[PDB]
Amino acid sequence: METIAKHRHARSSAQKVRLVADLIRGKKVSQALDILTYTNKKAAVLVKKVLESAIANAEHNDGADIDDLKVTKIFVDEGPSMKRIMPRAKGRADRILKRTSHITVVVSDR
Amino acid sequence: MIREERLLKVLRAPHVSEKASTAMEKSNTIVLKVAKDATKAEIKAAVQKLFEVEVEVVNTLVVKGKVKRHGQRIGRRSDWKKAYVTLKEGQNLD
Amino acid sequence: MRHRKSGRQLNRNSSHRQAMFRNMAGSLVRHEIIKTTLPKAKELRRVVEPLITLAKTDSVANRRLAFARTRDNEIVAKLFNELGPRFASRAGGYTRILKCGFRAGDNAPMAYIELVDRS
Amino acid sequence: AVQQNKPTRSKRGMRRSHDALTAVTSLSVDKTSGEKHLRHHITADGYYRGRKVIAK
Amino acid sequence: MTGIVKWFNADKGFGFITPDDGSKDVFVHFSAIQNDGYKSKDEGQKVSFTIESGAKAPAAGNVTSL
Amino acid sequence: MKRTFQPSVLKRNRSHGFRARMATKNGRQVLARRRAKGRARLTVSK
RNA sequence: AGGACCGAACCGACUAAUGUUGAAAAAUUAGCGGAUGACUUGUGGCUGGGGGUGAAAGGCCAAUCAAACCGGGAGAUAGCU
RNA sequence: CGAAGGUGUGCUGUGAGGCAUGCUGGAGGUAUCAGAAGUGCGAAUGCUGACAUAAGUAACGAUAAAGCGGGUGAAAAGCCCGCUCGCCGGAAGACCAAGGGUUCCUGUCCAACGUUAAUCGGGGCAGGGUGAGUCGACCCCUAAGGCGAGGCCGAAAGGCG
Ligand SMILES: [Mg+2]
Ligand SMILES: [Mg+2]
Ligand SMILES: [Mg+2]
Ligand SMILES: [Mg+2]
Ligand SMILES: [Mg+2]
Ligand SMILES: [Mg+2]
Ligand SMILES: [Mg+2]
Ligand SMILES: [Mg+2]
Ligand SMILES: [Mg+2]
Ligand SMILES: [Mg+2]
Ligand SMILES: [Mg+2]
Ligand SMILES: [Mg+2]
Ligand SMILES: [Mg+2]
Ligand SMILES: [Mg+2]
Ligand SMILES: [Mg+2]
Ligand SMILES: [Mg+2]
Ligand SMILES: [Mg+2]
Ligand SMILES: [Mg+2]
Ligand SMILES: [Mg+2]
Ligand SMILES: [Mg+2]
Ligand SMILES: [Mg+2]
Ligand SMILES: [Mg+2]
Ligand SMILES: [Mg+2]
Ligand SMILES: [Mg+2]
Ligand SMILES: [Mg+2]
Ligand SMILES: [Mg+2]
Ligand SMILES: [Mg+2]
Ligand SMILES: [Mg+2]
Ligand SMILES: [Mg+2]
Ligand SMILES: [Mg+2]
Ligand SMILES: [Mg+2]
Ligand SMILES: [Mg+2]
Ligand SMILES: [Mg+2]
Ligand SMILES: [Mg+2]
Ligand SMILES: [Mg+2]
Ligand SMILES: [Mg+2]
Ligand SMILES: [Mg+2]
Ligand SMILES: [Mg+2]
Ligand SMILES: [Mg+2]
Ligand SMILES: [Mg+2]
Ligand SMILES: [Mg+2]
Ligand SMILES: [Mg+2]
Ligand SMILES: [Mg+2]
């Protein structure tokens, strides 16, 4: 039984988060949580709060045992890009992109 | 003689405030929200007639209305007028 | 190149480094344990431990030297009245660096630097 | 000082081939409190190599 | 503070507050305000500004063209 | 640098205001064009 | 006394470096000239486009000038791309 | 008992194309033979919107400078309190006019804004706050100048006074 947790509209780049998400693919959740505990990136805080939510959903809604859980699927999608204007010299305007993400963590007993 | 109908349309409301409670307990001065076109003589006559109480002096000021945003649509509140009415000593009011 | 040299620049000029290590040495004498970055703690050992070796011999001249280094008579009093006889037998190594992880604002590697005879 | 052709997603992936993070190999375990920490770092409760070096 | 009180009861000191006015989609609405405002601007900006490009002209293109 | 807009409400209203437009014939044609177009702020005048 | 001298405020802009997707659609730094006079500045006013003004460089007239800007004739015309 | 549309597959025609059907979709579509066209796009330094690239690169706005303890808090390099350090000091202090127009103060919030975080804020939300016979304006007076009863002049508008 697979259990999903998502942090949609994650205020972070998908490229910056996929570096962290590639560390914990296929791992046991106690190892993935210790890796995310001692990884110093902000995306580790995001994907840790999502993995903790997926664990609690698997425990409450699905009766899954925590020691057998395993991160079977994890993937980061591109979210909506809010766009801001940063002024440059000589009156020229540049349109910066303020990327978002959709973090998805699938955890299961398999 | 200022007419009683105008004297009934001059005063709008009492103004509740920390400053109004301080001036009421210390200087014996009430703070009123009045009509915008009301003058000081109309206020002194209204308080001296409708409350039957002795007014020493009236100080006035105009309060500019704030600019608010309901949702995303801009809007502006009304300008209103504020009166500090100093009662004579011994006078009392609810 | 940096052959056989010593002392960290710490992205500061010389007067800023001298006033920063003067403040940090006074704060370490005052509280006996502080949390700063690990490079500042390592360069602070080269400031504080000479003050204690100076403080082992309570003279008026050494009080004036420790005042010229620290500019705090409360620090000079704690140095010569307490930490002198406290460290009177240790052959150096009066302090201890304890790495305590990473600062949340800039991922700076922090460390607790404390005196040895604290607890 | 600027490109003349659009570089492909293949070259982008090959440039990002080395930008991968190295996970921490193994967390050291305190001998007294039994909790995990970084090797040569103090624990979260303030233990390091057994003794309580700082209260909290 | 009070979302939007459809109205605020002074009889007690509470408020009936329905409107999502001030909600995060309202916040996206102000995001939109500034969004297309700035965009119109950006356009008009690079319009009225990027004029005085020398483009090598004032000292090198000049000498070339001779 | 000193830019070209140094504001002054008195000079703004004497030059572009309502009574300055209503004074002359062509200024009255300005207010007739803005009413036909349906301007919210018909002039400068506050 | 002085369209006198040296020199800050103030006004200006001779030289160099930086910068040139700038901190800045002309500036900063180090020096520089005048500095009781044909000085400078605030506020308000007047002069209108083949017109103004100009110690005169075709300079300036809202970051636009060998004839401003806006609207209209107007879908000018283009044996040219 | 599943239309158009979307997405596949199979078949078919010399071609533009055509037919059947699976999934999605959930209400319209239309044979034939005629008729009328805003009737077919890859290019026009084409127009509008969206998304790439360079690239997680440059940069994060004066080289006046920060250090520590405690507090709050989900979390503190940036907030508060404190002790030190440094900077301006004919200003980088204080008071105004012009101009702006509530940015003032208090409580609360951190999505957006702030070139980082933010518990903070000139940010959001709510409330409060500007008190005059003497200050200033208004007002009496006129300058440059403007308007201008009549008037003079001018195709008209209007110009001058
Ligand atoms: Mg500019
Ligand atoms: Mg008043
Ligand atoms: Mg060495
Ligand atoms: Mg640095
Ligand atoms: Mg020095
Ligand atoms: Mg080419
Ligand atoms: Mg790389
Ligand atoms: Mg002279
Ligand atoms: Mg200079
Ligand atoms: Mg001189
Ligand atoms: Mg010539
Ligand atoms: Mg010009
Ligand atoms: Mg012309
Ligand atoms: Mg011409
Ligand atoms: Mg024609
Ligand atoms: Mg044409
Ligand atoms: Mg179907
Ligand atoms: Mg179809
Ligand atoms: Mg279908
Ligand atoms: Mg149809
Ligand atoms: Mg066509
Ligand atoms: Mg073609
Ligand atoms: Mg094209
Ligand atoms: Mg990139
Ligand atoms: Mg490169
Ligand atoms: Mg580089
Ligand atoms: Mg860099
Ligand atoms: Mg800065
Ligand atoms: Mg601190
Ligand atoms: Mg700082
Ligand atoms: Mg402080
Ligand atoms: Mg100084
Ligand atoms: Mg000075
Ligand atoms: Mg506001
Ligand atoms: Mg404030
Ligand atoms: Mg936050
Ligand atoms: Mg932020
Ligand atoms: Mg605010
Ligand atoms: Mg007067
Ligand atoms: Mg008069
Ligand atoms: Mg006159
Ligand atoms: Mg007449
Ligand atoms: Mg006249």
From Swiss-Prot, chain A:
One of its GO terms (cellular component) is cytosol. GO terms for biological process: assembly of large subunit precursor of preribosome; cytoplasmic translation; cytosolic ribosome assembly; response to antibiotic; ribosome assembly; translation. GO terms for molecular function: large ribosomal subunit rRNA binding; structural constituent of ribosome. Keywords: Antibiotic resistance, Ribonucleoprotein, Ribosomal protein, RNA-binding, rRNA-binding. InterPro entries: Ribosomal_uL22, Ribosomal_uL22_bac/chlpt-type, Ribosomal_uL22_bac/org-type, Ribosomal_uL22_CS, Ribosomal_uL22_sf. It comes from the Bacteria. Changing residue 91 to A/D/S: Abolishes translation elongation arrest of SecM. Changing residue 8 to C: In strain: SK1048; decreases translational rate, tRNA binding and subunit association at 44 degrees Celsius; does not alter 23S rRNA or uL4 interactions; not erythromycin resistant. L-tryptophan binds at residue 90. NCBIfam families: rplV_bact (TIGR01044). Part of the 50S ribosomal subunit. In TnaC-stalled ribosomes forms part of the binding pocket for L-Trp with the leader peptide and uL4. The wild-type allele (erythromycin sensitive) is dominant over the resistant allele, and is also dominant over the temperature-sensitive allele at both low and high temperatures. Belongs to the universal ribosomal protein uL22 family. This protein binds specifically to 23S rRNA; its binding is stimulated by other ribosomal proteins, e.g. uL4, bL17, and bL20. It is important during the early stages of 50S assembly. It makes multiple contacts with different domains of the 23S rRNA in the assembled 50S subunit and ribosome. PANTHER family: CHLOROPLAST 50S RIBOSOMAL PROTEIN L22-RELATED, LARGE RIBOSOMAL SUBUNIT PROTEIN UL22M. This is Large ribosomal subunit protein uL22. It comes from Escherichia coli (strain K12).
UniProtKB/Swiss-Prot annotation, chain F:
Pfam families: Ribosomal_L34. The keyword Transcription does not apply. GO terms for biological process: cytoplasmic translation. GO terms for cellular component: cytoplasm; cytosolic large ribosomal subunit. Keywords: Ribonucleoprotein, Ribosomal protein. Signal peptide: none annotated. Belongs to the bacterial ribosomal protein bL34 family. Part of the 50S ribosomal subunit. This is Large ribosomal subunit protein bL34. It comes from Escherichia coli (strain K12).
